[PDB]
Amino acid sequence: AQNPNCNIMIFHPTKEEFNDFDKYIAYMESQGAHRAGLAKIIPPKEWKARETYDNISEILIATPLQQVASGRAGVFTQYHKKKKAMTVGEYRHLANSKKYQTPPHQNFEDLERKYWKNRIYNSPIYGADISGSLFDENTKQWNLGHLGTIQDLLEKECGVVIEGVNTPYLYFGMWKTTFAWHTEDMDLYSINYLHLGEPKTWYVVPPEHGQRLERLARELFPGSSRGCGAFLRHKVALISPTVLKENGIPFNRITQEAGEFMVTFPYGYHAGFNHGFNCAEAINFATPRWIDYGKMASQCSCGEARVTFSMDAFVRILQPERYDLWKRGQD
């Protein structure tokens, strides 16, 4: 078996290899990339997402989210407090202000140390889940607004035609903005392009070991676990690399820089944080290998994990026994 230690792999496709998206994902998996839960893809030097980022300041962040932490430095939850709308230009200025800016640091590892030491004592503001794309319509390769849809994949594989759409989301981040431990909706793949700005550090658990992370989470967040059998779907729980190591949970880490893609694989738990002002674009996608993960995905029915209506068809077709209970939670 390829990549038996489940290391995060880094790929450098040629411009010829960058033409056929599906084919390259399949190639990465032939080399064992999926066993890590996360891969980095560095685009060919000839490629670009768009010409410049000089004219993005008028994009609106309708509902910026203030991420307020509770708990201890290495084990905490965060809740999202809604703030007043602001443009990306206003948000960038806020990110760079003395209150929110990245501190002096020696390197990525120094900044990582500072993040886990001090994150809970601040409440950074995030622009998340903003429907849109910053890819030029003329960018033909790895354009996250032009990918084959998950609905068409399900139809090609299983012959069922379903409603729903599949479009990208923008994320504007600042120092200490945080994404909690989670897998994707329906344990789908995701792909994330860092368009502009400071890095994003990722943590990931191999899919074959996801249940180990779930068991630790139940132990560390006991009230949440009693409330919901799939509470990581709520996307509010953080556990530090130090605490993961103390509990023998297998994981890896890597830092994504501007101009790089990351792919997360079905049932690969991931979490992370932003180093400073940045902008990323991400979308879910599927392959034939995903279908069995979609069938087995654990669902939240307690009401906290409200999601887009396009997930309805996924649960309805792949998980008909679970559908009634899940749908009640979406109401």
Ligand X SMILES: O=C(O)CNC(=O)C(=O)O
- Site residues for ligand X per CB under 6 A: 171, 179, 190, 192, 264, 280, 282
Least separation in angstroms between residue 264's CB and ligand X is 5
Q: Is 302 annotated as a binding residue?
A: yes
Q: Report yes or no: 201 and 112 within 8 Å, Cβ to Cβ.
A: yes
Position among 36, 220, 282, 300 found at the interface with Zn ion (CB under 5 A): 300
Least separation in angstroms between residue 184's CB and Ni ion is 5
Q: What are phi and psi of 168, to 5 degrees?
A: -75, 165
Position among 50, 304, 307, 316 found at the interface with Zn ion (CB under 5 A): 304
Q: Is 19 annotated as a binding residue?
A: no
Q: Where are the alpha helices (DSSP H) in 39-149?
A: 88-95, 108-118
- Whichever of 94 and 300 has its CB closer to Zn ion, that residue is 300
Q: Residue 323 is inside which H or E element, if any?
A: helix 320-330
Q: Side by side, which strands form the sheet with 270-274? A: 178-182, 270-274, 200-204, 252-256
300 binds, among ligand BZI, Zn ion, ligand X, none (CB under 5 to 8 A by kind): Zn ion
Distance from C-alpha of 17 to C-alpha of 304, rounded to nearest angstrom: 41
- Whichever of 94 and 238 has its CB closer to Ni ion, that residue is 238
Q: Which residues pair with 78 in a beta bridge?
A: 69
Which residue type does 96 have?
A: N
318 binds, among Zn ion, ligand X, Ni ion, none (CB under 5 to 8 A by kind): none
Q: Using CB under 6 A as the criterion, what x/- string covers residues 286-315 for binding ligand BZI?
A: ----------------------x-xx--x-
Please tell me what DSSP assigns to residue 191.
Answer: E
282 binds, among Zn ion, ligand X, Ni ion, none (CB under 5 to 8 A by kind): ligand X
Strand, helix or coil for residue 34: helix
**What DSSP string runs through 299-314?**
---SSS----THHHHH
- Whichever of 142 and 179 has its CB closer to ligand X, that residue is 179
- Whichever of 240 and 310 has its CB closer to ligand BZI, that residue is 310
Distance from C-alpha of 32 to C-alpha of 29, rounded to nearest angstrom: 5
Q: Is 126 annotated as a binding residue?
A: yes
Angle between helix axes 310-318 and 320-330 (nearest 10 degrees) is 150
Distance from C-alpha of 18 to C-alpha of 42, rounded to nearest angstrom: 10
**Residue ranges at the known binding site:** 126, 182, 184, 192, 200, 228, 234-235, 270, 300, 302
Residues at the annotated binding site for 2-oxoglutarate? Answer: 126, 192, 200, 235
Binding residues for Zn(2+): 228, 234, 300, 302
- Interaction site with ligand BZI (CB under 6 A): 150, 164, 166, 185, 284, 308, 310-311, 314
